[PDB]
Amino acid sequence: VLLDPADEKLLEEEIQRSQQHAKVVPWMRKTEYISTEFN
């Protein structure tokens, strides 16, 4: 069919948030779990 991504987007009604999870915040690290490969 003759169709474009610009047309595709228009078929939806409303689909198109909280972005602060990925903040730097030099006082906040990440977590650590149980591997089977370590010192």
Partner 1 sequence: LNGLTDRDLCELNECPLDPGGYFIINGSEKVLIAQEKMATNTVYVFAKKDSKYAYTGEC
* Residues at the interface with partner 1 (CB under 8 A): 36-38
Based on CB atoms, which residue is closest to partner 1, 15 or 34?
A: 34
Based on CB atoms, which residue is closest to partner 1, 3 or 34?
A: 34
- Cα 29 to Cα 38: distance, rounded to the nearest angstrom: 20
Based on CB atoms, which residue is closest to partner 1, 27 or 38?
A: 38
- Compute the least distance from the CB of residue 39 to partner 1, in Å: 9
What would the DSSP string read from start to end of 2-38? Answer: ---HHHHGGG-SS-----GGG---TT--------S--
